[PDB]
Amino acid sequence: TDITNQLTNVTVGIDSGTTVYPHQAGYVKLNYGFSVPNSAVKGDTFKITVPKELNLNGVTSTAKVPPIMAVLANGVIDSDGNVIYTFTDYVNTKCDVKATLTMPAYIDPENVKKTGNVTLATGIGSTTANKTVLVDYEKYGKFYNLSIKGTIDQIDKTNNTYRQTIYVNPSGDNVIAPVLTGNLKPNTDSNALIDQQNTSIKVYKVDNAADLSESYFVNPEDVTNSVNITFPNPNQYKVEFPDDQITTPYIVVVNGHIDPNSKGDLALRSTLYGYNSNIIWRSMSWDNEVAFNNGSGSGDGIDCPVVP
């Protein structure tokens, strides 16, 4: 049975700052507390509502919700993105059961494509919480006529893959003989494996910077074949783009692998090299890093009465 509505003493809340910076390791915490009906038995359920503006995975390909520990309940994310918890047999014998739960949640890149005010709401049954925050994706990086910014997604730790989206020349500058390299970030013990058999790169031409996401969600003019992609040094890729200039942005999507025996995390550096109109050679670098977070849940009950 679904016992969502028979939950009592329900409280809900959202913990975050007033501005969230999804590209500076910002996230939010969804908090919940409730009493469970003594009449709860194993296999009973209850549903948390999670809004479209969030997901529970962020940079990671999927997420697990915290089992609530006393196991009091096991959770899964449904196809709407809401969370269903199933009660264990713990409720079969325990009374005055109570529980609290926290889940980190992340600004969903596809539903929040631009910087602006977002009102976030979650809840359990009729008990809801809401918060309105500014989602600030901030700015791409720039140095003379060299702009660049990149973001990671879909870190899959089952399959050891990652994906990285880079905007080259998001600022629409003229670059003469532009070159991009993709590297590990020094001294991180980075777990990226960047080579011919671990790394596949695609590159897209952009007509109008305006068609680009601030969130870096990308819906993939493919110009992969018109460019020269090479693996010139250990754990480094290089992308070489008729007149030796570019005047538009480019999207570079990298489908790579990680090393699960590596002692560090996914930590990446991408560099754009190019001349300006004065024929000076410069470079602009962009680091990409990650931070992982977990939620937790716990409950308590007492022995139900026994007639004496």
């Binding site: 500076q24 995975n57 980190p104 990149g150 470079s283 602009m284």
Partner: peptide, 12 residues
């Protein structure tokens, strides 16, 4: 030569 960065959060 110059340098910026992003960091992103995600589920364990």
């Amino acid at each position: 030569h110059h340098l910026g960065g992003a960091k992103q959060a995600g589920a364990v």
